[PDB]
Amino acid sequence: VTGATEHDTVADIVLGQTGEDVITISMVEPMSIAVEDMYGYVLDTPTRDIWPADEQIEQKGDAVALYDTKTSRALGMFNNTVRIDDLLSPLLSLVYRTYIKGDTMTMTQGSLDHLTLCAAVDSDITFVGNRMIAPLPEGYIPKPMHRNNSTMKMLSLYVALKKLENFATNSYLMAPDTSIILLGAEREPAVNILRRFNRNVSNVRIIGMGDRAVEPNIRVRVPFPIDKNISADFIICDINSYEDQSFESMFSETISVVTTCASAATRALVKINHPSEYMINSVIERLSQLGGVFYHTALLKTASQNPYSYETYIYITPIAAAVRFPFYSNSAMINRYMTAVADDEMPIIPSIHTVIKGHSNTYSPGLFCGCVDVQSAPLALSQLKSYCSEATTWRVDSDDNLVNIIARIDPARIALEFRTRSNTSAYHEYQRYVPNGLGFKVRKTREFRYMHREVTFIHKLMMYALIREQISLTENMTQVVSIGGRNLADISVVPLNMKYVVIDPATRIETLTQEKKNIEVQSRPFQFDAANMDLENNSIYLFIAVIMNEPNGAATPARMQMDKIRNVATAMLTRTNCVAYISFYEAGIITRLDQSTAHKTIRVEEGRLKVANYVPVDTLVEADVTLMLRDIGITHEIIRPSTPELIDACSNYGIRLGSTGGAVLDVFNHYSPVIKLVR
Amino acid sequence: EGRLKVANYVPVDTLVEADVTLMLRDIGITHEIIRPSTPELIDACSNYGIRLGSTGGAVLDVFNHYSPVIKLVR
Ligand SMILES: C[S@@+](CC[C@H](N)C(=O)[O-])C[C@H]1O[C@@H](n2cnc3c(N)ncnc32)[C@H](O)[C@@H]1O
Ligand SMILES: C[S@@+](CC[C@H](N)C(=O)[O-])C[C@H]1O[C@@H](n2cnc3c(N)ncnc32)[C@H](O)[C@@H]1O
């Protein structure tokens, strides 16, 4: 951000247009994941006892209101931009091309690698012996399996149904059961894949049934004709409403679908196109009328689904004893649909900027793409630090005088910059690069409008957006003390006008570069002793991922975290205008993760939530914290990031959700809530 | 096994005073914890012609302080 060179009224820099044979820009970045991580799912479970009449009418009002006023236009734009078949096609292509060359050996009969191979190729695969693939006969080239967008999702759903009944299974075979896929299935590839996958089994009957089915599937309409009997062990239903109807018609259609599926098999997975609290709870109520049988239901969402899809799957199975808590309220997987309210502004399309300006804030999020003369490269690189924290500079040939530059606009860098009027940079360091210090790369460069970030980065961005909205809503405030802030991570929320203070025992000290940007750093620890707590009358205090750990790198028990919360709450009393924000993992996420298999980085170890290679930390119970803050006597509030925060993060930052990250993001956000302690 | 066996009853478990008091502060009712004292011991031993024993004298001080009464009033 800062340097030893002082700029003033510097002339702007124009980047010339680069040919399409040197720099090419794509829309959505493909994502690379291990083959075993395509088949995941995350559980969500009901947490309510009764469905009273006032709740019924309010939920109906909240649901019908979001039908005519369709889902947010920005979410619709991202959902159809980031598909799933394209988001993982290179992996399947790699598998198929490896298979054809004769490089596929030593995989288990029913492993997920075998299932992926059955989805990647068309021909039948035989085992010359257990745990080895027979080489294909000479002269045989099998065409790659042409599957649609919703095929890998069906494979993951089949895996989930084959995994719920036995959580310790390592193979997925159905001897000698049967299954049917309730789906229109114009040209169903999943039936072919599953038939090719269970061939060694003695006899399993699997087939699709739907409205527009072709051979070998059967063309029927749901509910089934009265003069026919259908019966199977598994149901994987996903029925869509292509035509436009009212709320009542889709209600009746989905009620009939759920009843028929639940009466057709011992286990069923049914897709809900419009998952609302009222709709899901009405489905739950109708489940009880099915002959007085007790049904156990839990919301599900696979890891091979469209990351931005608000559609969630329901799971239905009979249970010996009726579940005490059958109803859902403010669940993780419904709040992606509730909070997807139509926008008050048009979606912002990322753009390419070709002109570099000196301290000019007229830049929308996007990329800096262009080429400049080698002599102006240090100057342009010194002037674009005010917007971007990274830049990839390279040259084509040593006989070429122009230098190609790519850089992404970073809102955190904008927030840290522009806090003052001073313009300093290490322009003296960059002139050491001319002319051969800027790299060479003959090959074409491929950069994406929406790059990839891990799940925790997405969550932090959404929570920062939420806190920034909250802080901007208030008024008459002097500073924002970031207790947990390390390396100025929380600066994305503080307004440029007001101060910002960091109290972290481990942070770099450089007094001049912190004076030049109006920040103050205190490398002393934050003592949670209400007698010595240094809370200004008019300030905002941020506690982000700091309560849950120790500054030396250790984890803290739940009672210590509760004591810290109590200390900050009590010491925050006897103040005029004080606001504090605290975040903590909740105890409801342990129940969901220990039943699921989509855990990639957010994992559970011995009851402590192992998140992103950090030490395993225990969770807190919402009821206990709420009771403690009720007894203390301060105005508390549990707030969680929602869909608009996700959209704003993924739009300002040119980053999009991953295939595996989409399933876990619903649950993760609901169980890392934020406390708003105000006066 | 962590329970109180009194008068050959079925052993029963014990409540924490902090939890009980904390519960009544949220509910919103006036509450108090009352305990019998030495004058109550004298009155029981005078109005009824009874006296303490040897094994009962030592244990009764502990028995009083941990069998309290909650006086909820409006
Ligand atoms: C998602 S589309 C099918 C897309 C593709 N075949 C696939 O594998 O997902 C859902 C299908 O369900 C069928 N469908 C719609 N309403 C139905 C109903 N009421 N009863 C039975 N099938 C229905 C439609 O024909 C439609 O093709
Ligand atoms: C998990 S990081 C959180 C980073 C940042 N707060 C954020 O937005 O996520 C927590 C950091 O806070 C620091 N820290 C731990 N205890 C602290 C305390 N009691 N007071 C101030 N800082 C602390 C630690 O050095 C640790 O690196």
CSV table of N, CA and C in Angstrom, one decimal, chain A residues 214-304:
chain,number,residue,atom,x,y,z
A,214,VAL,N,-38.5,-42.1,-22.3
A,214,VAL,CA,-38.3,-42.9,-23.5
A,214,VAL,C,-37.8,-44.3,-23.1
A,215,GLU,N,-37.5,-45.2,-24.1
A,215,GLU,CA,-37.0,-46.5,-23.8
A,215,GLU,C,-35.6,-46.3,-23.1
A,216,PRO,N,-35.3,-47.1,-22.1
A,216,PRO,CA,-36.1,-48.2,-21.5
A,216,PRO,C,-37.1,-47.7,-20.4
A,217,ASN,N,-37.1,-46.4,-20.1
A,217,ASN,CA,-37.9,-45.9,-19.1
A,217,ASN,C,-39.4,-45.9,-19.5
A,218,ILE,N,-40.3,-45.8,-18.6
A,218,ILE,CA,-41.7,-45.9,-18.8
A,218,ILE,C,-42.4,-44.5,-18.7
A,219,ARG,N,-43.2,-44.2,-19.6
A,219,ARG,CA,-43.9,-42.9,-19.7
A,219,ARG,C,-45.2,-43.0,-18.9
A,220,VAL,N,-45.2,-42.5,-17.6
A,220,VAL,CA,-46.3,-42.4,-16.8
A,220,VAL,C,-46.4,-41.1,-16.1
A,221,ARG,N,-47.6,-40.8,-15.6
A,221,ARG,CA,-47.9,-39.5,-14.9
A,221,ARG,C,-48.1,-39.8,-13.4
A,222,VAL,N,-47.5,-38.9,-12.6
A,222,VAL,CA,-47.6,-39.0,-11.1
A,222,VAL,C,-48.7,-38.1,-10.6
A,223,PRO,N,-49.6,-38.7,-9.8
A,223,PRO,CA,-49.7,-40.0,-9.2
A,223,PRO,C,-50.0,-41.1,-10.2
A,224,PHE,N,-49.6,-42.3,-9.9
A,224,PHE,CA,-49.7,-43.4,-10.9
A,224,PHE,C,-51.1,-43.8,-11.2
A,225,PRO,N,-51.4,-44.4,-12.3
A,225,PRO,CA,-52.8,-44.9,-12.6
A,225,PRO,C,-53.3,-45.8,-11.6
A,226,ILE,N,-54.6,-45.8,-11.4
A,226,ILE,CA,-55.2,-46.6,-10.3
A,226,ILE,C,-55.0,-48.0,-10.6
A,227,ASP,N,-55.1,-48.5,-11.8
A,227,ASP,CA,-55.0,-49.9,-12.2
A,227,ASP,C,-53.6,-50.2,-12.5
A,228,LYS,N,-52.7,-50.0,-11.6
A,228,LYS,CA,-51.3,-50.4,-11.7
A,228,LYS,C,-50.7,-50.4,-10.3
A,229,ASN,N,-49.7,-51.3,-10.1
A,229,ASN,CA,-49.0,-51.5,-8.9
A,229,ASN,C,-47.5,-51.2,-9.1
A,230,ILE,N,-47.0,-50.3,-8.3
A,230,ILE,CA,-45.6,-50.0,-8.4
A,230,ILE,C,-45.0,-50.1,-7.0
A,231,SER,N,-43.8,-50.7,-6.9
A,231,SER,CA,-43.2,-51.0,-5.5
A,231,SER,C,-41.7,-51.2,-5.7
A,232,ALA,N,-41.0,-50.5,-4.9
A,232,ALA,CA,-39.5,-50.6,-4.9
A,232,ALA,C,-39.0,-50.3,-3.6
A,233,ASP,N,-37.6,-50.4,-3.4
A,233,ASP,CA,-37.0,-50.1,-2.1
A,233,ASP,C,-36.5,-48.6,-2.1
A,234,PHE,N,-36.1,-48.0,-3.2
A,234,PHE,CA,-35.6,-46.7,-3.2
A,234,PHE,C,-36.4,-45.8,-4.2
A,235,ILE,N,-36.6,-44.6,-3.8
A,235,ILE,CA,-37.2,-43.6,-4.6
A,235,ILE,C,-36.3,-42.3,-4.7
A,236,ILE,N,-35.9,-41.9,-5.9
A,236,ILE,CA,-35.2,-40.7,-6.1
A,236,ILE,C,-36.0,-39.8,-7.1
A,237,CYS,N,-36.8,-39.0,-6.5
A,237,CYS,CA,-37.8,-38.2,-7.2
A,237,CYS,C,-37.3,-36.7,-7.4
A,238,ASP,N,-37.4,-36.2,-8.6
A,238,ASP,CA,-37.1,-34.8,-8.8
A,238,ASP,C,-38.0,-34.3,-10.0
A,239,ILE,N,-39.2,-33.8,-9.6
A,239,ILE,CA,-40.2,-33.4,-10.6
A,239,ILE,C,-40.3,-31.9,-10.6
A,240,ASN,N,-40.1,-31.3,-11.8
A,240,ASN,CA,-40.1,-29.9,-12.0
A,240,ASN,C,-41.4,-29.4,-12.6
A,241,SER,N,-41.7,-28.1,-12.5
A,241,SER,CA,-42.8,-27.4,-13.0
A,241,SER,C,-42.4,-26.5,-14.1
A,242,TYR,N,-42.3,-27.1,-15.3
A,242,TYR,CA,-41.9,-26.3,-16.5
A,242,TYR,C,-42.9,-25.2,-16.8
A,243,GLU,N,-44.2,-25.5,-16.8
A,243,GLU,CA,-45.2,-24.5,-17.0
A,243,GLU,C,-45.3,-23.6,-15.8
A,244,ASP,N,-46.0,-22.5,-16.0
A,244,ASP,CA,-46.3,-21.5,-14.9
A,244,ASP,C,-47.7,-21.7,-14.4
A,245,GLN,N,-47.8,-21.9,-13.1
A,245,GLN,CA,-49.0,-22.1,-12.4
A,245,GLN,C,-49.1,-21.2,-11.1
A,246,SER,N,-50.2,-21.3,-10.4
A,246,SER,CA,-50.3,-20.5,-9.2
A,246,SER,C,-49.7,-21.3,-8.0
A,247,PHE,N,-49.8,-20.7,-6.8
A,247,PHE,CA,-49.2,-21.4,-5.7
A,247,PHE,C,-50.0,-22.7,-5.4
A,248,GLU,N,-51.3,-22.6,-5.6
A,248,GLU,CA,-52.1,-23.8,-5.2
A,248,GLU,C,-51.8,-25.0,-6.1
A,249,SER,N,-51.6,-24.8,-7.3
A,249,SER,CA,-51.4,-25.9,-8.2
A,249,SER,C,-50.1,-26.7,-7.9
A,250,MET,N,-49.0,-25.9,-7.8
A,250,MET,CA,-47.7,-26.6,-7.4
A,250,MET,C,-47.8,-27.2,-6.0
A,251,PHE,N,-48.6,-26.6,-5.1
A,251,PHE,CA,-48.8,-27.2,-3.8
A,251,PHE,C,-49.5,-28.5,-3.9
A,252,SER,N,-50.6,-28.6,-4.7
A,252,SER,CA,-51.2,-29.9,-4.9
A,252,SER,C,-50.3,-30.9,-5.5
A,253,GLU,N,-49.6,-30.5,-6.6
A,253,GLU,CA,-48.7,-31.4,-7.3
A,253,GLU,C,-47.6,-32.0,-6.4
A,254,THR,N,-47.0,-31.1,-5.5
A,254,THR,CA,-45.9,-31.6,-4.6
A,254,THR,C,-46.5,-32.5,-3.5
A,255,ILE,N,-47.7,-32.1,-3.0
A,255,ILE,CA,-48.3,-33.0,-2.0
A,255,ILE,C,-48.6,-34.4,-2.5
A,256,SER,N,-49.2,-34.4,-3.7
A,256,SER,CA,-49.4,-35.7,-4.3
A,256,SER,C,-48.1,-36.5,-4.6
A,257,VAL,N,-47.1,-35.8,-5.1
A,257,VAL,CA,-45.8,-36.4,-5.3
A,257,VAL,C,-45.2,-37.0,-4.1
A,258,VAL,N,-45.2,-36.2,-3.0
A,258,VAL,CA,-44.6,-36.7,-1.7
A,258,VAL,C,-45.4,-37.9,-1.2
A,259,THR,N,-46.8,-37.8,-1.2
A,259,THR,CA,-47.6,-38.9,-0.7
A,259,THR,C,-47.3,-40.2,-1.5
A,260,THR,N,-47.3,-40.1,-2.8
A,260,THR,CA,-47.1,-41.3,-3.6
A,260,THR,C,-45.7,-41.9,-3.4
A,261,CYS,N,-44.7,-41.0,-3.3
A,261,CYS,CA,-43.3,-41.5,-3.1
A,261,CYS,C,-43.2,-42.2,-1.7
A,262,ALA,N,-43.8,-41.6,-0.7
A,262,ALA,CA,-43.7,-42.1,0.6
A,262,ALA,C,-44.5,-43.4,0.7
A,263,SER,N,-45.5,-43.6,0.0
A,263,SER,CA,-46.3,-44.8,-0.1
A,263,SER,C,-45.7,-45.9,-1.1
A,264,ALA,N,-44.7,-45.5,-1.8
A,264,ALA,CA,-44.2,-46.4,-2.8
A,264,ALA,C,-42.9,-47.1,-2.4
A,265,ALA,N,-42.2,-46.6,-1.4
A,265,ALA,CA,-40.9,-47.2,-1.1
A,265,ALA,C,-40.6,-47.0,0.4
A,266,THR,N,-39.7,-47.8,0.9
A,266,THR,CA,-39.2,-47.7,2.3
A,266,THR,C,-38.2,-46.6,2.5
A,267,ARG,N,-37.6,-46.1,1.4
A,267,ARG,CA,-36.8,-44.9,1.5
A,267,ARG,C,-37.0,-44.0,0.3
A,268,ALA,N,-37.1,-42.7,0.4
A,268,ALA,CA,-37.4,-41.8,-0.7
A,268,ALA,C,-36.6,-40.5,-0.5
A,269,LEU,N,-36.2,-40.0,-1.6
A,269,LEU,CA,-35.6,-38.7,-1.7
A,269,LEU,C,-36.4,-37.9,-2.8
A,270,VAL,N,-37.1,-36.8,-2.3
A,270,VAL,CA,-37.9,-36.1,-3.2
A,270,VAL,C,-37.4,-34.6,-3.2
A,271,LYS,N,-37.3,-34.1,-4.4
A,271,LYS,CA,-36.9,-32.7,-4.6
A,271,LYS,C,-38.1,-31.8,-4.4
A,272,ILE,N,-37.8,-30.7,-3.7
A,272,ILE,CA,-38.8,-29.6,-3.5
A,272,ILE,C,-38.3,-28.4,-4.3
A,273,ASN,N,-39.1,-28.0,-5.3
A,273,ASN,CA,-38.7,-26.9,-6.2
A,273,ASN,C,-38.7,-25.6,-5.4
A,274,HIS,N,-39.7,-25.4,-4.5
A,274,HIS,CA,-39.8,-24.1,-3.8
A,274,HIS,C,-39.9,-24.5,-2.3
A,275,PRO,N,-38.7,-24.7,-1.7
A,275,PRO,CA,-38.7,-25.1,-0.3
A,275,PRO,C,-39.0,-24.0,0.7
A,276,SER,N,-40.2,-23.9,1.2
A,276,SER,CA,-40.6,-22.9,2.2
A,276,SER,C,-41.0,-23.6,3.5
A,277,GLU,N,-40.9,-22.8,4.6
A,277,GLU,CA,-41.3,-23.3,5.9
A,277,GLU,C,-42.7,-23.9,5.9
A,278,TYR,N,-43.6,-23.1,5.3
A,278,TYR,CA,-45.0,-23.6,5.2
A,278,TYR,C,-45.1,-24.8,4.4
A,279,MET,N,-44.4,-24.9,3.2
A,279,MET,CA,-44.6,-26.0,2.3
A,279,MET,C,-44.0,-27.3,3.0
A,280,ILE,N,-42.8,-27.2,3.5
A,280,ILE,CA,-42.1,-28.3,4.1
A,280,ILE,C,-42.9,-28.8,5.3
A,281,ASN,N,-43.4,-27.9,6.2
A,281,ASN,CA,-44.2,-28.3,7.3
A,281,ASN,C,-45.5,-28.9,6.9
A,282,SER,N,-46.2,-28.4,5.9
A,282,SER,CA,-47.4,-29.0,5.4
A,282,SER,C,-47.1,-30.4,4.8
A,283,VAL,N,-46.0,-30.6,4.2
A,283,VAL,CA,-45.6,-31.9,3.8
A,283,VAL,C,-45.4,-32.9,5.0
A,284,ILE,N,-44.8,-32.3,6.0
A,284,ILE,CA,-44.6,-33.1,7.3
A,284,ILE,C,-45.9,-33.5,7.8
A,285,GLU,N,-46.9,-32.6,7.9
A,285,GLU,CA,-48.2,-32.8,8.4
A,285,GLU,C,-48.9,-33.9,7.6
A,286,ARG,N,-48.8,-33.8,6.3
A,286,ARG,CA,-49.5,-34.8,5.4
A,286,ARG,C,-48.8,-36.2,5.5
A,287,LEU,N,-47.5,-36.2,6.0
A,287,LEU,CA,-46.8,-37.5,6.1
A,287,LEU,C,-47.5,-38.3,7.2
A,288,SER,N,-48.1,-37.7,8.2
A,288,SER,CA,-48.7,-38.4,9.4
A,288,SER,C,-50.0,-39.0,9.0
A,289,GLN,N,-50.7,-38.5,8.0
A,289,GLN,CA,-52.0,-39.0,7.6
A,289,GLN,C,-51.9,-40.3,6.9
A,290,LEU,N,-50.7,-40.7,6.4
A,290,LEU,CA,-50.6,-41.9,5.6
A,290,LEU,C,-50.8,-43.2,6.4
A,291,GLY,N,-52.0,-43.4,6.8
A,291,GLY,CA,-52.4,-44.6,7.5
A,291,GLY,C,-51.9,-44.8,8.9
A,292,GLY,N,-51.6,-43.6,9.6
A,292,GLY,CA,-51.1,-43.7,10.9
A,292,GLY,C,-49.7,-44.2,11.1
A,293,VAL,N,-48.9,-44.1,10.1
A,293,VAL,CA,-47.5,-44.6,10.1
A,293,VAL,C,-46.6,-43.4,10.5
A,294,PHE,N,-45.6,-43.7,11.3
A,294,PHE,CA,-44.7,-42.6,11.8
A,294,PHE,C,-43.5,-42.5,10.8
A,295,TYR,N,-43.2,-41.3,10.3
A,295,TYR,CA,-42.2,-41.1,9.3
A,295,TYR,C,-41.1,-40.2,9.9
A,296,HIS,N,-39.9,-40.5,9.6
A,296,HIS,CA,-38.7,-39.7,10.0
A,296,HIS,C,-38.2,-38.9,8.7
A,297,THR,N,-38.0,-37.6,8.9
A,297,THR,CA,-37.7,-36.8,7.8
A,297,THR,C,-36.5,-35.9,8.1
A,298,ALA,N,-35.6,-35.7,7.2
A,298,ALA,CA,-34.5,-34.8,7.4
A,298,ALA,C,-34.1,-34.1,6.1
A,299,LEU,N,-33.9,-32.8,6.1
A,299,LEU,CA,-33.5,-32.1,4.8
A,299,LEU,C,-32.1,-32.5,4.4
A,300,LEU,N,-31.9,-32.6,3.1
A,300,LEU,CA,-30.7,-33.0,2.5
A,300,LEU,C,-30.3,-32.1,1.4
A,301,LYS,N,-29.0,-32.0,1.0
A,301,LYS,CA,-28.5,-31.2,-0.1
A,301,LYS,C,-27.2,-31.8,-0.5
A,302,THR,N,-27.1,-32.3,-1.7
A,302,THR,CA,-25.9,-33.0,-2.2
A,302,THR,C,-24.8,-32.1,-2.6
A,303,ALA,N,-23.6,-32.6,-2.7
A,303,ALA,CA,-22.4,-31.9,-3.1
A,303,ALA,C,-22.2,-31.8,-4.6
A,304,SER,N,-23.0,-32.5,-5.3
A,304,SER,CA,-22.9,-32.5,-6.8
A,304,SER,C,-24.1,-31.8,-7.4
